[PDB]
Design a protein around this nucleic acid. Structure first.
Length: 48
DNA sequence: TAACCGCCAAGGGGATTACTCCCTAGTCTCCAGGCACGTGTTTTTTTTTTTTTTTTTTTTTTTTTTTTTCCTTTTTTTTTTTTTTTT
């Protein structure tokens, strides 16, 4: 255990694998909006 | 070789005369099928509404989110200014 130091009762499977990162970061996907631009036709919020 | 003619012989039935009889010509008189007139009830034609399939039209196709790229005219005709040549 990390917090207490006790042995884990169930033995665990460990070893090196090969992992790949993906381009879907949260910095490129977070979005928030309170009030902003409106359309010139329907006065609705933007896209994207 | 038997048609035809001449001669002879025989017989069969149509013509003739008379008697009869019976069936039809003629004339009333009653009445009934034959026929003139009217029309029908099936037959064909025409509408009428439906039926049944084919064809055409129209509308539809789960939602949300994030990046680029290209384009957002173009040739073709008409006009208008400019430049060069000539008298």
């Amino acid at each position: 255990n990390g917090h207490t130091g006790r042995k884990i009762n169930a033995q665990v499977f460990l070893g090196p694998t090969y992992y790949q990162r993906l381009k879907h970061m949260v910095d490129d996907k977070i979005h928030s909006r309170a009030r902003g631009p409106v359309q010139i036709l329907v006065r609705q919020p933007m896209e994207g």
